[PDB]
Scaffold this active site. Structure first.
Site, mmCIF file in Angstrom:
data_model
loop_
_atom_site.group_PDB
_atom_site.id
_atom_site.type_symbol
_atom_site.label_atom_id
_atom_site.label_comp_id
_atom_site.label_asym_id
_atom_site.label_seq_id
_atom_site.Cartn_x
_atom_site.Cartn_y
_atom_site.Cartn_z
ATOM 1 N N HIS A 32 0.618 -1.243 0.081
ATOM 2 C CA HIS A 32 -0.151 0.237 -0.269
ATOM 3 C C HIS A 32 1.073 0.774 -0.090
ATOM 4 C CE1 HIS A 32 -2.052 -2.643 2.681
ATOM 5 N NE2 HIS A 32 -2.494 -2.885 2.473
ATOM 6 N N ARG A 88 4.988 -4.201 9.147
ATOM 7 C CA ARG A 88 5.309 -3.192 7.620
ATOM 8 C C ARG A 88 6.435 -3.708 7.954
ATOM 9 N NH1 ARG A 88 2.362 3.132 8.718
ATOM 10 N NH2 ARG A 88 1.041 1.846 9.624
ATOM 11 N N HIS A 112 1.265 4.818 2.053
ATOM 12 C CA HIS A 112 0.863 5.211 3.125
ATOM 13 C C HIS A 112 1.307 6.843 2.777
ATOM 14 C CE1 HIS A 112 0.463 1.664 6.058
ATOM 15 N NE2 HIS A 112 0.543 1.354 4.940
ATOM 16 N N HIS A 170 -11.262 0.823 3.667
ATOM 17 C CA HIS A 170 -9.815 0.332 3.030
ATOM 18 C C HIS A 170 -10.750 -0.883 1.958
ATOM 19 C CE1 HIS A 170 -6.259 -1.798 2.811
ATOM 20 N NE2 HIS A 170 -6.652 -2.334 2.778
ATOM 21 N N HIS A 202 -8.984 2.951 -0.077
ATOM 22 C CA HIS A 202 -8.274 4.219 -0.030
ATOM 23 C C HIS A 202 -7.113 4.080 -1.487
ATOM 24 C CE1 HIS A 202 -7.983 2.732 4.060
ATOM 25 N NE2 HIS A 202 -9.096 3.766 4.438
ATOM 26 N N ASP A 251 -5.014 1.988 -1.571
ATOM 27 C CA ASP A 251 -4.822 0.456 -1.797
ATOM 28 C C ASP A 251 -4.173 -0.976 -2.776
ATOM 29 O OD1 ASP A 251 -5.699 0.273 0.782
ATOM 30 O OD2 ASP A 251 -7.668 0.771 0.405
ATOM 31 N N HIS A 284 -3.042 4.511 5.157
ATOM 32 C CA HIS A 284 -3.321 4.622 3.762
ATOM 33 C C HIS A 284 -3.654 6.031 3.283
ATOM 34 C CE1 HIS A 284 -4.203 -0.264 3.913
ATOM 35 N NE2 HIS A 284 -2.630 0.594 4.412
ATOM 36 N N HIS A 338 3.762 -4.959 3.766
ATOM 37 C CA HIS A 338 2.927 -5.791 4.511
ATOM 38 C C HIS A 338 3.052 -6.556 5.369
ATOM 39 C CE1 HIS A 338 1.067 -1.880 6.217
ATOM 40 N NE2 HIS A 338 0.555 -1.906 4.934
HETATM 41 CU CU LIG Z 1 -0.898 -0.719 4.260
HETATM 42 CU CU LIG Z 2 -6.546 0.607 2.610
#
Ligand SMILES: [Cu+2]
Ligand SMILES: [Cu+2]
Ligand SMILES: [Cu+2]
Ligand SMILES: [Cu+2]
Lengths: 151, 151
Positions: free
Chosen positions: A44, A141, A46, A69, A78, A81, A61, A118
């Site tokens: 993702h 993360r 961020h 999400h 998002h 995403d 995000h 992640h």
């Molecule tokens: Cu993330």
């Molecule tokens: Cu998200």
């Protein structure tokens, strides 16, 4: 503006280099990530390009339209995403994504923001708990980098 | 963006945290850098936010107006020419610059570009030689980081 790049680093073995290129009216994301455990891993954008506390300071995000999400193919997701990257048995994941909502300029620009890979699979907002609707239950993360302008 | 941050890292012991804040038609740059040899060190915004080859891949000084290298108070300077920072006997440099040419938005935006702290003093384009006209004779890149959007 037209091309961007991110180098992913963390405190573990996971590393990678992600390239972004505006092609036509969309953005193509390519690269590879090594040192991962076999299987799917959330991937993702961020919100902040702040690595003062490692990947934790990147925030949540990127989500300028204030939605929940989701997966990259959903209406409700998002902007950051990008779903999951899948690593082989050797720990290598090849990234090949075309995304409509991210950009390299303007309101949806991800330049100066953070790319994160992640620990676990992202459940695409369908897990059923509150956390699914924020992060996909994607967990810690493992590596991250700030997205920068490339030649 | 109204605020940005950059974490400087290298292959040696030089490290640092730089904050950026838009104020009026200026950018205020604050922070500290440690692990330096006492004395002045050139401090510039380089063109690309590409750390694939350490600080070497950041490219030359950010120069959208195609000028020669100068000090920050010079009319003939690169946009990325922020002069020198000064480290004390304990190797601690305190950063506090107000610059009107760099920006956090629009054409001269430095978001997604690279901040570099150099080995030697920047001669501000007054070295007498030709190298002076390009880099200020600042030498090696000790540490660098991509400039990211901050909260
Ligand atoms: Cu993330
Ligand atoms: Cu998200
Ligand atoms: Cu420089
Ligand atoms: Cu210069």
């Amino acid at each position: 503006a037209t091309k961007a790049v991110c180098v992913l680093k963390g405190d573990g073995p996971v590393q990678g280099t992600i390239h972004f290129e505006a092609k036509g009216d969309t953005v193509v994301v390519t690269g590879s990530i090594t040192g991962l455990t076999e299987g799917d891993h959330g991937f993702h954008v961020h919100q902040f390009g702040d690595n003062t506390q490692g990947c934790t300071s990147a925030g949540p995000h990127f989500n300028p339209l204030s939605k929940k999400h989701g997966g990259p193919k959903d209406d409700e997701r998002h902007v950051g995403d990008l779903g999951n990257v899948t690593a082989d048995k050797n720990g290598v994941a090849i990234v090949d994504i075309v995304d409509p909502l991210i950009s390299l300029s303007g309101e949806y620009s991800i330049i100066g923001r953070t790319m994160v890979v992640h620990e676990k699979p992202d459940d695409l907002g369908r897990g059923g708990n509150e956390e699914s609707t924020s992060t996909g239950n994607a967990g810690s993360r493992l590596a991250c980098g700030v997205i920068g302008i490339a030649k």
